[PDB]
Amino acid sequence: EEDLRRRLKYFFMSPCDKFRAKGRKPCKLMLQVVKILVVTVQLILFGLSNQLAVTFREENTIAFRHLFLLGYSDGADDTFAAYTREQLYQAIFHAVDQYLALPDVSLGRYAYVRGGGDPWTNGSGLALCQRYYHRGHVDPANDTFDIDPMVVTDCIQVDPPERPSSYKNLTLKFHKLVNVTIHFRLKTINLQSLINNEIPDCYTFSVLITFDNKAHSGRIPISLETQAHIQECKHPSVFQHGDNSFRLLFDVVVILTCSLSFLLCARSLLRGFLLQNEFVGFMWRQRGRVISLWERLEFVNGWYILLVTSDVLTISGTIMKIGIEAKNLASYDVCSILLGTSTLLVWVGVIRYLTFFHNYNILIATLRVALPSVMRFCCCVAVIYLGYCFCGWIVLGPYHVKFRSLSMVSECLFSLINGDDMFVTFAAMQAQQGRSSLVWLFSQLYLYSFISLFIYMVLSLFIALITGAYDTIKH
Amino acid sequence: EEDLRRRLKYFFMSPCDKFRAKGRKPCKLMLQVVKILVVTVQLILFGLSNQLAVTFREENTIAFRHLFLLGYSDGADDTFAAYTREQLYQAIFHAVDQYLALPDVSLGRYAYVRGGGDPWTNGSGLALCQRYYHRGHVDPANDTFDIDPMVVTDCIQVDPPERPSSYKNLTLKFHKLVNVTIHFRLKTINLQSLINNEIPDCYTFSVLITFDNKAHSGRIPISLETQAHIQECKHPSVFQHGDNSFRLLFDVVVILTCSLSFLLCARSLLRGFLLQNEFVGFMWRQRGRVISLWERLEFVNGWYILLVTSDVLTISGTIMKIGIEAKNLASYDVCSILLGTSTLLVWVGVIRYLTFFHNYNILIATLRVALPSVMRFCCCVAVIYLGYCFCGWIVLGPYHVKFRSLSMVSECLFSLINGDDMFVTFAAMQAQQGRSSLVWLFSQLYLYSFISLFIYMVLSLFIALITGAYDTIKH
Amino acid sequence: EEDLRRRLKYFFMSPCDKFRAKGRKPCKLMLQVVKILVVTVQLILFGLSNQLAVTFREENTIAFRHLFLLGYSDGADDTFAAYTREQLYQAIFHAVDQYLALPDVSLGRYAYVRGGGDPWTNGSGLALCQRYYHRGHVDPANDTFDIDPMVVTDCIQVDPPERPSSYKNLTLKFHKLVNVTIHFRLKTINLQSLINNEIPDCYTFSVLITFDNKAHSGRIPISLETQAHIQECKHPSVFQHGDNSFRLLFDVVVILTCSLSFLLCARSLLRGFLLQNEFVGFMWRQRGRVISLWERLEFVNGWYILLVTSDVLTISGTIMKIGIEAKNLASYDVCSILLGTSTLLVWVGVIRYLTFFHNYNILIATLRVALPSVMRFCCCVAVIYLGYCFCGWIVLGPYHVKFRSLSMVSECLFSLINGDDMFVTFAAMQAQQGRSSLVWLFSQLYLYSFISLFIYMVLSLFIALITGAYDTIKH
Amino acid sequence: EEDLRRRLKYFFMSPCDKFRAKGRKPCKLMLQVVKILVVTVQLILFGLSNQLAVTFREENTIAFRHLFLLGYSDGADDTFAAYTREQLYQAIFHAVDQYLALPDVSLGRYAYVRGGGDPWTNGSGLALCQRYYHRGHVDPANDTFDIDPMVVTDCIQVDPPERPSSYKNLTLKFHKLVNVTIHFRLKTINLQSLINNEIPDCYTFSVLITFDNKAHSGRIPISLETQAHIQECKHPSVFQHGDNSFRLLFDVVVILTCSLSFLLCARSLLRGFLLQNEFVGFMWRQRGRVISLWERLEFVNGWYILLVTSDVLTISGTIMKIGIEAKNLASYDVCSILLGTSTLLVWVGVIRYLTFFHNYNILIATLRVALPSVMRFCCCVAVIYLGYCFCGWIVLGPYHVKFRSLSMVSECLFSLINGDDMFVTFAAMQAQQGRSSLVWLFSQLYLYSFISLFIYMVLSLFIALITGAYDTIKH
Numbered sequence A, B, C, D: 001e002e003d004l005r006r007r008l009k010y011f012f013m014s015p016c017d018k019f020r021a022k023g024r025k026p027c028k029l030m031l032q033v034v035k036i037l038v039v040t041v042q043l044i045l046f047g048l049s050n051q052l053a054v055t056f057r058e059e060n061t062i063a064f065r066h067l068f069l070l071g072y073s074d075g076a077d078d079t080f081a082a083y084t085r086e087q088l089y090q091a092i093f094h095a096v097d098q099y100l101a102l103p104d105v106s107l108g109r110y111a112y113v114r115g116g117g118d119p120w121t122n123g124s125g126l127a128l129c130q131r132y133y134h135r136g137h138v139d140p141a142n143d144t145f146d147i148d149p150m151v152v153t154d155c156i157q158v159d160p161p162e163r164p165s166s167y168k169n170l171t172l173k174f175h176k177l178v179n180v181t182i183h184f185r186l187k188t189i190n191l192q193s194l195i196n197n198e199i200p201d202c203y204t205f206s207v208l209i210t211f212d213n214k215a216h217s218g219r220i221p222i223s224l225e226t227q228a229h230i231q232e233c234k235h236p237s238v239f240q241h242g243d244n245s246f247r248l249l250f251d252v253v254v255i256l257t258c259s260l261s262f263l264l265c266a267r268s269l270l271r272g273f274l275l276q277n278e279f280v281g282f283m284w285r286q287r288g289r290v291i292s293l294w295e296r297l298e299f300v301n302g303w304y305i306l307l308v309t310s311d312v313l314t315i316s317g318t319i320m321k322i323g324i325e326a327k328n329l330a331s332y333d334v335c336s337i338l339l340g341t342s343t344l345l346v347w348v349g350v351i352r353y354l355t356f357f358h359n360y361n362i363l364i365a366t367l368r369v370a371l372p373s374v375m376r377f378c379c380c381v382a383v384i385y386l387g388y389c390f391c392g393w394i395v396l397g398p399y400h401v402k403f404r405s406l407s408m409v410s411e412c413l414f415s416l417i418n419g420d421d422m423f424v425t426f427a428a429m430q431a432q433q434g435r436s437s438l439v440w441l442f443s444q445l446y447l448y449s450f451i452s453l454f455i456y457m458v459l460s461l462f463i464a465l466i467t468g469a470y471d472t473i474k475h
């Protein structure tokens, strides 16, 4: 600490006094400032392209309910179920002929696929497919049942008529059926070339309609699910790259300011490699047992790891982004996360340069000194939260509605310790007030015991653990 | 305390130092650790069987609305009410003929019951039953009314036609009717042998449809309620016990690790029987008046009573669980509570072994020293909560909706002191702004006075009583 | 204070030590204990009678929508509005003939009224009544309009046919109409003699159906409102007073225990009349200027005024209650408040006898010493709450929905400072995002400024004002 | 401070002692008191006129759905969309003929416009207008597409028949269409002369109905939007200004009490001009460096700037208000804000005269001394709030519903840090549990990380920063 002190003096300056103590320009700092205004614009200019490309996937699904399902209304997609025998027939037949008579009745200008896949042959594109147990004979009240699990794949195909059948001959064997599925495809031309302002892309759907019976109980859920798939196409349209060469040059400007940002922040951390061996030569281990590496973690540059973490995930989006043009990758998911997560790390990086004004120093530093004592209390409670979910996850599983699945129960109790959807979870049990009247006696004790523990006893400590950390640090 | 001290020294060790001070293995401890991973799997492997067996009870009820009720739509089951004279007829007749013409129109493969019960004879299975006052003659505006309570059980039965009537002759006497009920049964074969992967069970319903009039006011609620009943049946199906003998052997492994857990925890408490008489021989009652038995309650092993409480309720489920196979008991309720409650006591048992790290010692111990002062404040408030329900329980009883029943009001105010369903309870009165305008003047003062008392005055003490207990114990 | 001290010593005893210091029995106390178990049963035994007598008023209103309104469905009673010209006709005509053809089509056994009132004559019971401006002639785009306010009461009556017309000749003058109303009555026999178990009462409705146009804007709200009126009737039914003489004798037992309760509590306060003049003779005003009468308010018996307030309102219900039998009063409102409010004052009277255990003494007494400082802060805020309602009450009046009326806005902001119906009040403006786009710019600043003031700045003082009162009183 | 002290002594008196130390009447004060009772009545007497004049704009929009849209029901205005080819036709044709056959079928007494505007000619008033790409030819699966953006304005007009066509010849070219719009107008006479009690105004609508397709995806949203426009008209009606000259004279009384209020409050601040130069002559800058102008901001009259701000905005409403009579301005928006904002500043002006009672002095002054330390903490958090919106604003943009637009996300998170609409935002993702299953893995971490930061860590400091300011100021 004779000559190390002035060498370590530069290692904990402010940004402001160091500029006057040495005289080197804050471009090493202010590149962080401009890349805020870079990447935020990069997100929103991605955001106009994404928000269009999902509504095209969305609206064509909403449309295909109102073409291929008899008597569909909006809203409930689960209550739509066929009960009678003939409504299973009529929903099938009303789904078949719309596929047959499509371009005379539809608006949207679609085209048939002429497939060759594995639930297809060559020539046909639609396929309805019965599924039932091969070897079996069941009867109640004179009880005998063979439930030999073996499908009977009766994929009775049908071709489309193109240009200006025996599916009527159909039986279903309702005592034995498992499910009836219907596969086909349609091609389309997406036509949302407003914000691109030029060349669009050319998409391909695949529609499944399922008359499922995994219940054998007299109710058949009727569903529609799609997947959209994308490829490229040949255009005669005119004057593409006008402002559209400018976005590509702009993404270079995006990848300009991040490129040198990786270099200097590593070079700033490279100084730590040059200082960590000098400290050990404090009179050539005259003490020696200072070294325990957690005190060296303060000697490690702290929040510089955050900026370099933001920077790697930043360039991983823009590299992935320019695959929108002529690469087979067009899944906008991984562009959304990587340009979504990296923007979250940029804005929190400015916090480090916010804590040098003294009335900003002493407030966020409370979160630094509390989080050791926070994490140690937190493991006491999180046993009990997890230990309390597994009771209601099967006990109040089917009887309730919002305690059905795996992760929704983990949402439901944690939503209930703040005060939203609390009374409705009380009220939904009371239709079972006499029906399974023992279980309502348990659920009423289940929710009364719970929030009396977390809200009225635990979270009061969770205030007083943070109130202390502000209290100790201001004196 | 000469030789007692080292004998009592072992009585408040940590688990860790005792292993090195004597040298006996922590299998006495770690059986608690593995039975976490036992019973939690036992719950979820019960959970796949239960969640299927209620949806079969659920979906067949949802189906039987859409067969036996004219013009039923989903959602509201209470607003469905017949007002005219003939809609009482048409709903009956549309309920009758579906029972007659069932297997030609339904999917689900049911069978008739050919009953012999007390609202039955032998031969018929359906019975509609008028109910009215025997001796009476009423007339408004020339006022005379005999309301002699005496049923007229006119159970006009009807048989089913099985294999490839005068209920039309029916009058109801609408000025005198009480209610019209309809009883029948149906058998079924549950066919959810996916997760069993082999042999299913064979069920039996009983359906009641009630055209109730306990109002005599021109509206007839129409309802449907079932009960499911289970027995066994003879199977030709093949290769049952493949992985299904393995679950039975697994339940022995469940009842393995709990069996010895009862033994050793009692033996640990058996040491207390060997130490409680030695302490009294502290120089042969040289003091004597130490003994007041609450100080002996700390000398009582504290949380060991919790594990033995968890263990007895654990084996009471698995014994009850193996009655799924070939015992007449099949009510999954008491298996759900006992494998539900015992799992809640397991996870909280680990808390005891969590409080020996010193920053875990001093946080949950606050709840120990506060709960005396908590319980004493709590009896002051809970008089007022109960003393405030009984006002609104009949005053705002019929005028409101969510203040109707007994226990829902106890839910409603306690939901209202946190902040869910608060504004809607204000808003529902304002349709009675002129109609009974005095009562809305009371309800507006009812809810304004209330949360100004509990939220703004009482619960602030309920924070400051717990904040103190953290404050005193950290110095 | 020589001989006054022992005389004032009895004036602040506990209840417990005074029983041993003098030896007089606690029947003076325990009558408060038993009247808890009296009046609470009196409320609930009133509650079975009230909850039936409103559902009869309720269900007959719900029924008369489904008879007299064309195409009514449940739920919305405001959106039901006739737009076309002929749907005003068809709803009238479908309301007329149901009144004509009632007993052949209805269940409920009603009877016609044969009225003689002021919008009636003798002979007819139904009356439809046009209302329009007498002297006027309006025309847009060649603009001239006389809006002389003068009704034209064209009450075209019609009689009913009783026992086994020219309303068709009707024009309405749609350019000039104000509203069309329809009056009639029906009698009934309430038949809910289950919990009385004997003699019922005989009721009378009056139904108004209004085709209002206070808008002249092309939409006519269609409404139905009733009033129920009660009188008595002659019965042939048998064995009335079996357990029904027992309730009358029970109400004497109710008015037994309250009667002497007024006497002794006044006599306890009568001691204060005997002590207030003795204190002034403290050495014959040797000081004199002690007397300022607020220190005498502690010398006033404090919570004894509460019991006597509960007692007067208690007997005012039971006196009012026995008018159910044979008095013209049958309005259950004032029985509901007076047996509702008096029960609230009984349970809070027990609190006084709860604060002598020392860990109960020092907790509710905080509310005593804080409420001076509470009320003084409270007048600072309640200016601002009232000063903030009047902005949104007309500015966000019609544009919103839940800021419409007078007192609902006073509900709405106070519901919004806790956290229910908060986001929906934000979201409802965004349909006016472009339509009146200036006003949404104001509402977004209206709700952002507000809860940032009360929740984040004011209510934090409202915790710290109560936390102090617990803090000062425990040292 | 020799003679300045008594001169500055008057500068910080109370209002009460100054009245006795000099003897000048508090009319200088009490004009603030009466203008509370002035302007509040002025708001509400404006409020009766405004609340009528928007319902006339409201109800005629609600009516025109039920005339011009086939099969419209109430509630959802977005789900109403035509899917088939002919339902686009039938909704157009059912919109056309109602415009043709209006006065025989409607109630409301409208009149046609006989327009001459830019999407009009002279003679016709209705115009339907196709819009499609001029030069283009598209085809999927043999891919070629020309998307040359050029409208084809085929506004096929049509006249009305007035007094007692070839739009049938119509094709739409569905493969090429952009949108179909329909313009017309209607005049009306508002007839809500109840609270004016005399002369009404004469209005003019303009209705647009849009069959938009900015999607080209097989769904056409169908919408209706209006704008109301007002002018004046000639009346024969009688006895106008009875109480209506009295309101005009009352607005002078409103502008009376505000007029002198500007004068004296400025004159009170004019004293500051007479005192600010005297203080500098404190022994002719014997110190001099006191002067830093923030200490002079306390020497600036503080809350007097608030009253003069309220007063200027007060007269700007009433001047704007009397343009209701005979000026072309009739937009009630700017009267609503200026009579809405100025009332908010009046009631908060009374607060200054509330803080001289000593238990009122020391409570609101906490907000004065905290707000420096509040604002400095607040800029640390508001970076993170804004830095966290931009992630979810495009990532959870289309996948969610309530994260769609720009400013609703800013509402949504801030609604979520208090506890309303919290669980529903969790639950809406789980329909995408398998569909884009990666993104739900991100949203579940998005909302778990968030409120664990603001609610459980940040806002606890936000209590402890205000609790301190009450704590320091009371000692």
Ligand SMILES: C[C@H]1CC(C)(C)N(C(=O)CN2C(=O)c3ccccc3C2=O)c2ccccc21
Pocket: A378, A379, A381, A382, A383, A384, A385, A386, A414, A417, A454, A462, D452, D456
């Ligand atoms: C979110 C944070 C805040 C804290 C301490 C108040 N807290 C709880 O209130 C209860 N709680 C769980 O039992 C839990 C388990 C798994 C995920 C999230 C949670 C969860 O919210 C908790 C507990 C464990 C881990 C994290 C937390």
Ligand SMILES: C[C@H]1CC(C)(C)N(C(=O)CN2C(=O)c3ccccc3C2=O)c2ccccc21
Pocket: A452, A456, B378, B379, B381, B382, B383, B384, B385, B386, B414, B417, B454, B462
């Ligand atoms: C749940 C616990 C928490 C505490 C103290 C805050 N608290 C209340 O806020 C009000 N309150 C009752 O009047 C009450 C009565 C019966 C069951 C549950 C409750 C109930 O929640 C209360 C009062 C009595 C007994 C338990 C409690």
Ligand SMILES: C[C@H]1CC(C)(C)N(C(=O)CN2C(=O)c3ccccc3C2=O)c2ccccc21
Pocket: B452, B456, C378, C379, C381, C382, C383, C384, C385, C386, C414, C417, C454, C462
């Ligand atoms: C209910 C009590 C609690 C307290 C102090 C927190 N508080 C408010 O938060 C705001 N507030 C009003 O401006 C107000 C005005 C009229 C009736 C009720 C209220 C009302 O709740 C308030 C203010 C004035 C009078 C009473 C109260």
Ligand SMILES: C[C@H]1CC(C)(C)N(C(=O)CN2C(=O)c3ccccc3C2=O)c2ccccc21
Pocket: C452, C456, D378, D379, D381, D382, D383, D384, D385, D386, D414, D417, D454, D462
């Ligand atoms: C309303 C006030 C209260 C305070 C401090 C608790 N607080 C927040 O909790 C979070 N927060 C924002 O990130 C934010 C950004 C823009 C407008 C409003 C807000 C906003 O409410 C905040 C933060 C920044 C500016 C004002 C505020």
